[PDB]
Each structure stands twice: as C-alpha cells, then as structure tokens.
Amino acid sequence: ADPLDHLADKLFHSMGSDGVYARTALYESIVERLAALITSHREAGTEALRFPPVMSRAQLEKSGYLKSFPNLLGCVCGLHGTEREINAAVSRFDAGGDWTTSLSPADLVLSPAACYPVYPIAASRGPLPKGGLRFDVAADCFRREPSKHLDRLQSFRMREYVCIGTPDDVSDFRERWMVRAQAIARDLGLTFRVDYASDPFFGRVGQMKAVSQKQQQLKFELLIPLRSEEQPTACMSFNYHREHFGTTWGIQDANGEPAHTGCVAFGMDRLAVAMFHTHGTDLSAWPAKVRDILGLQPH
Amino acid sequence: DPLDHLADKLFHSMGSDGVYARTALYESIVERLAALITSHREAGTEALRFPPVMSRAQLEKSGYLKSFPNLLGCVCGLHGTEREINAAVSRFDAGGDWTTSLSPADLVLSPAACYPVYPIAASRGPLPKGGLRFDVAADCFRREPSKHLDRLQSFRMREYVCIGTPDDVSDFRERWMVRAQAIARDLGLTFRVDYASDPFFGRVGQMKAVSQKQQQLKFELLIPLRSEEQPTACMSFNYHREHFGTTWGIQDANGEPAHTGCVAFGMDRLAVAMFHTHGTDLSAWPAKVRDILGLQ
Ligand SMILES: Nc1ncnc2c1ncn2[C@@H]1O[C@H](COP(=O)(O)O)[C@@H](O)[C@H]1O
Ligand SMILES: Nc1ncnc2c1ncn2[C@@H]1O[C@H](COP(=O)(O)O)[C@@H](O)[C@H]1O
Ligand SMILES: [Zn+2]
Numbered sequence: 001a002d003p004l005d006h007l008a009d010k011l012f013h014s015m016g017s018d019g020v021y022a023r024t025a026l027y028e029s030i031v032e033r034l035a036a037l038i039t040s041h042r043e044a045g046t047e048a049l050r051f052p053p054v055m056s057r058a059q060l061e062k063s064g065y066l067k068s069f070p071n072l073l074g075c076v077c078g079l080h081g082t083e084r085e086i087n088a089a090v091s092r093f094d095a096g097g098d099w100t101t102s103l104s105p106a107d108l109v110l111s112p113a114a115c116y117p118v119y120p121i122a123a124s125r126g127p128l129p130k131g132g133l134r135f136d137v138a139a140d141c142f143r144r145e146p147s148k149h150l151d152r153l154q155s156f157r158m159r160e161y162v163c164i165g166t167p168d169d170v171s172d173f174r175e176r177w178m179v180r181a182q183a184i185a186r187d188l189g190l191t192f193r194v195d196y197a198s199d200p201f202f203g204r205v206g207q208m209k210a211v212s213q214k215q216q217q218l219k220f221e222l223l224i225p226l227r228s229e230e231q232p233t234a235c236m237s238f239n240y241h242r243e244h245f246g247t248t249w250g251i252q253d254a255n256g257e258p259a260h261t262g263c264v265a266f267g268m269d270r271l272a273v274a275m276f277h278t279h280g281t282d283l284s285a286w287p288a289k290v291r292d293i294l295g296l297q298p299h
Numbered sequence: 300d301p302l303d304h305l306a307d308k309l310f311h312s313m314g315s316d317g318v319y320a321r322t323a324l325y326e327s328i329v330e331r332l333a334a335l336i337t338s339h340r341e342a343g344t345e346a347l348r349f350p351p352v353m354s355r356a357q358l359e360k361s362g363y364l365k366s367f368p369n370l371l372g373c374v375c376g377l378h379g380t381e382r383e384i385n386a387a388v389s390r391f392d393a394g395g396d397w398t399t400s401l402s403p404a405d406l407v408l409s410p411a412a413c414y415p416v417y418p419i420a421a422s423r424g425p426l427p428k429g430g431l432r433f434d435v436a437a438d439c440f441r442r443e444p445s446k447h448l449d450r451l452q453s454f455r456m457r458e459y460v461c462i463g464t465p466d467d468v469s470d471f472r473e474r475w476m477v478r479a480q481a482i483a484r485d486l487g488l489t490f491r492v493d494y495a496s497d498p499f500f501g502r503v504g505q506m507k508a509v510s511q512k513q514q515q516l517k518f519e520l521l522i523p524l525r526s527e528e529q530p531t532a533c534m535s536f537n538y539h540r541e542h543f544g545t546t547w548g549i550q551d552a553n554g555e556p557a558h559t560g561c562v563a564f565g566m567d568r569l570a571v572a573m574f575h576t577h578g579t580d581l582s583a584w585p586a587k588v589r590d591i592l593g594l595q
C-alpha cells in the first residue's frame with residue numbers, strides 16, 4: 001500500500017480510470033482556498049486568463065511538445081466522416097464491434113500545461129513594453145501517465161504565473177517567485193526542499209535533454225516528501241524557457257530581441273493532497289496559522 | 300451576431316472556434332453564478348466535482364454514442380513502444396502525419412456533468428427512501444464548432460441530479476422548475492420555459508427529437524440572446540426514466556430500477572446571458588443583481 005492511499009476515501013471517488021477521480025466537497029473546498037491564497041500573492045499589473053481543458057493542436061505542435069513529451073499527450077479524436085460512415089460505426093458498436101476504427105484526430109488536444117496558450121496571445125499584441133508582461137493562468141491539464149498514486153494523476157489543475165520579457169525580467173521574476181513560493185509552503189506548514197530539476201523528456205534523446213536542462217539550471221522544483229523523503233513529490237516548478245517561446249511565436253522584447261519566458265507552476269491537486277497528507281482530513285485540527293491563511297476561522 | 304461585441308472584454312482567441320481563454324471579468328461572474336447556484340443546494344445533497352474527462356466505457360454504456368456520435372470528443376494517445384513513438388515524431392519532422400500512431404484511450408471528454416454519477420450511486424447498493432441527490436460539475440465538451448459566443452465546444456456545466464422512485468424525480472423536477480425560474484428572475488434575465496428536444500444526429504435522430512418533445516422528457520429555460528425568435532437554452536430539466544437505473548443496476552428502496560432526472564445549468568451560457576443583458580460594466584448592474592452575486 002502507498003502512504004497516500006488512506007486519503008482516497010475522504011477525498012476522491014473512483015471514475016473507473018486510474019488518475020481520474022471525482023473530488024469530494026472537502027477536497028474541492030481546500031483546492032479553492034489554495035487557489036484564493038495563490039491569487040492574494042498576484043503582483044500588480046498581472047493579467048489573469050482562464051483556459052479551458054483543450055487547446056489548439058497546431059499551437060501545441062508548433063510549441064515543440066511532440067518532440068519533448070509525445071507519450072504524455074492526449075489528443076482529441078472524433079467521428080468526422082459522412083452520415084453513412086458515422087451510422088456504420090454506431091451500428092458496429094451495436095453489434096459488439098469496435099466503433100473507434102472510425103475515429104480521426106480533431107484540431108484540438110487536451111492541454112498538457114496551463115501556460116502554452118498564453119505565448120501566441122502575447123505574440124499577437126506586438127512588441128513587449130519595458131519590464132515585459134506578466135500573466136496569471138490556470139487550466140485543467142492532461143498528461144497520459146496512468147497511475148494508482150494519488151500524487152500522479154492524468155487530469156489535474158495547474159495554476160501558473162508567467163513572465164514574458166528580457167532575460168533580466170524573467171530571471172528577476174523567477175528569483176522573486178522561488179522566495180515567495182517557499183514562504184507560501186512554509187506558511188502552509190509543509191515540509192519541503194527546493195532542488196535542481198528536469199522535465200520528463202521522452203526516450204533516449206530525452207535522457208540527454210534532461211541532463212542538459214538540469215545542468216543549465218532551467219528548472220527548479222519545490223519537493224515535498226509524501227511517500228518518502230528519498231522520493232519527494234514536485235508540487236511547484238520554477239521554469240526558465242530562455243527564448244524557446246519568444247523564437248517560436250515571434251515575441252520581441254524591449255531590446256528588440258526574441259523574448260525570454262519563465263513560469264512559476266503550482267500543481268493544485270498535488271498541493272491539496274500534500275495538505276491532507278500533512279495535516280489530516282479533519283480541518284478543525286489544522287494549525288491555527290494554516291487555517292487563518294486559508295480563510296477558515298483560525299481558532 | 301448580436302453577441303459578437305462581448306467577445307473583446309470576455310474572451311481571447313485560442314485559435315479554434317468555440318474554444319476561448321476567459322478574462323478575469325468573465326470568470327469572476329461564472330464563479331459568482333456558481334456560488335449563487337450553491338446557495339440553492341437542498342439539505343442532504345452530495346457535491347461531487349468531476350474532471351473534464353470520464354471513462355469511455357461508462358459513456359458507451361450510457362447510450363450517448365447511439366444518440367450524438369458526431370458530438371463526442373474521445374481521448375487518443377501514442378500508446379506504442381518507444382521505437383514506434385520516436386518514428387511517429389520523426390514522420391512529423393519529415394512533413395508527414397504523426398497521428399497515424401494514435402489509438403483510443405479508455406477516456407472521453409465528458410459531454411455532460413452527470414454521466415459519472417450513476418455508476419458511483421450504483422456502487423453504494425440499494426437507495427434509501429427519498430432517493431439520492433447530487434450536486435455535480437464538470438468542464439464539458441461537444442464537438443460542434445461555431446463562431447457564436449453561446450455555442451461553445453468546451454463549456455462548464457453544473458447540475459443537480461435526483462436518483463430514486465418516479466415520485467422522488469417528479470417532486471425534484473417540480474421543485475427545480477420553480478427554483479430555476481426564481482434564480483433567472485432574481486438575475487434580471489428575460490426568459491420563457493418551454494418543451495424541448497436534444498440534437499439527435501441524422502434522419503433517425505430528427506424523429507427521436509420529435510418523440511422527445513411530444514413526451515415531456517425535456518424542459519428548457521430559454522433566454523433571447525441573438526433574437527426572441529431563436530432564444531438560447533441556458534438551463535434544462537431532463538427526465539431519463541429508468542435508463543440509468545437499468546444500465547447501472549441502481550435499485551430504489553422498493554427494489555425496483557431507479558428513475559433519474561437532472562437540472563442542468565449552462566454556466567457559460569448564463570454568464571454570456573448576464574453580460575448581454577446587463578452589459579460589461581459591473582458597477583452599472585442593478586443593485587439586487589449585484590447583491591445576490593455578492594458584488595455589493
Ligand atoms: N501527473 C501529475 N499529477 C498531478 N500534478 C501534476 C502531474 N504532473 C505535473 N503536476 C503538477 O503540475 C506542476 C507543473 O508541472 P511541470 O510542467 O511538470 O513542471 C508540477 O510541479 C506538479 O505539481
Ligand atoms: N455548445 C454549448 N455551448 C455552451 N453551453 C452549452 C452548449 N451545449 C449545452 N450548453 C449548456 O448546457 C446546458 C445543458 O446542456 P444539454 O444537456 O444539451 O441540455 C444547456 O442548458 C446549455 O446552457
Ligand atoms: Zn508554464
């Protein structure tokens with residue numbers, strides 16, 4: 001049994017698929033209170049956008065996602081044929097056959113990260129002002145990694161603060177957030193460490209990309225011991241993308257150059273699970289300071 | 300379209316019709332409408348929050364595929380070996396189509412918020428007397444691309460679901476047809492409640508729509524958004540008979556297959572209806588509307 005398994009009964013209901021769960025009112029009230037807490041830390045001049053769980057497949061392909069995490073991508077498929085073809089697919093399904101043979105990809109994918117749709121949006125506004133742009137983004141994300149662990153979901157909520165500007169704007173933002181994020185986790189009564197990290201790039205070339213990314217310090221994670229202190233869970237990430245998105249989307253910074261980007265990502269579901277694992281499922285027993293910052297009556 | 304000017308302060312394009320990024324203004328109103336629906340939650344109602352995906356086998360079992368095959372969004376993935384996945388990416392790099400390596404997952408994008416609730420209720424055994432009530436929500440998907448702000452591919456649905464005897468479902472329906480009109484009235488919305496039909500696919504479906512409307516299986520709260528002649532369904536009451544009770548083996552307190560019904564709130568249509576009715580300046584909204592939404 002996994003150390004988080006005991007939480008499942010009070011927090012989730014099975015939906016017949018690993019990593020896809022219905023949330024209880026108790027679980028959801030904490031996710032919303034954590035979301036409101038992240039919002040209270042929003043810097044002045046930050047534009048808030050809320051993304052749906054799907055995005056343009058062409059934007060995602062253009063962003064280089066297939067080259068990095070093809071095995072994690074969820075693509076939207078549908079029955080796009082003629083009425084004759086669709087009726088036949090349904091008739092095959094009626095006869096105990098497989099209707100899915102008539103599926104073809106749609107022009108949409110399930111979003112793998114909340115920030116992806118923001119880059120073309122920022123690019124369409126022209127050159128960046130001095131100091132760059134700041135965005136507060138959120139989406140229900142999807143990653144094709146089935147697991148029975150409560151901290152490894154296929155559908156989960158992501159919340160991010162995104163900086164688009166010169167390498168200086170991004171570095172400063174990332175440093176500000178690595179300080180602020182630790183202060184938030186500390187106030188939430190969570191045990192953590194901030195360490196060098198890498199994205200789970202696919203395959204043999206992915207192992208090379210990961211080592212190269214880690215050495216360049218382009219990604220840090222706020223890690224919380226859930227199942228062990230040896231294998232902690234990344235509940236937040238601090239990502240510096242250099243000019244990857246600036247170049248892809250033709251975003252130009254103050255110095256006329258291809259814009260640099262970075263993001264602070266909060267795993268909403270991992271943070272909520274971390275809260276319940278740390279403090280238990282009885283909110284009335286949560287520490288006074290933790291209850292206070294989440295807007296529950298302190299005492 | 301009469302709703303078109305709203306797009307500027309409510310949405311941002313995402314490069315796909317019916318798929319939009321929401322502004323802070325738009326989202327604050329959706330959340331306030333959600334909190335208002337919550338304040339009308341009956342005692343003993345269990346609240347569940349569903350992700351945007353659900354079991355494909357549960358959806359296939361519910362009969363959605365037989366009625367709306369053209370609306371279903373399924374989840375596909377690259378489920379092969381590392382060698383196969385690398386080849387698909389390499390074909391994409393060489394100007395080819397990587398999607399040929401896709402196969403269906405065991406998941407679909409949810410077409411309605413209530414679907415996952417029926418197997419959940421069935422797994423608990425026989426129903427207590429009075430039945431069960433659920434408050435459910437999900438980001439839903441319907442494969443119907445459109446440029447109209449009230450016809451989205453990805454939209455939020457909020458529902459109250461009743462599972463029990465036909466008496467329990469009838470009482471719930473009556474209660475909600477009254478409560479839903481009181482909510483729209485308090486929101487300062489103009490509407491009518493009329494008989495309705497689901498958009499069943501094909502020629503065989505047109506007769507299913509006629510047969511559904513002749514029966515009182517579906518009522519809709521319609522709001523003039525583009526015109527008074529063609530209003531927008533912003534809420535619905537659906538009666539499913541014992542379809543879900545039979546499919547999932549849900550038995551009422553009398554040992555019979557349970558009947559189910561649901562009151563569905565289109566969160567995005569309601570928010571769009573609010574902005575079209577009252578404008579994009581919240582400070583100019585009527586005082587009673589601002590009060591019920593906690594804006595004052
Ligand atoms: N499979 C998952 N289950 C739950 N949360 C996740 C999952 N993958 C990523 N996240 C969360 O989202 C945050 C940002 O993801 P990443 O893009 O991998 O840095 C991570 O730090 C996690 O907190
Ligand atoms: N394509 C759509 N775009 C936005 N909202 C929708 C769409 N389809 C349905 N809805 C909303 O969801 C509610 C219930 O959907 P239905 O199950 O078709 O009756 C309706 O009352 C609408 O308010
Ligand atoms: Zn990001």
Ligand SMILES: [Zn+2]
Pocket residue numbers: 411412413414458537561562563
């Ligand atoms: Zn329903």
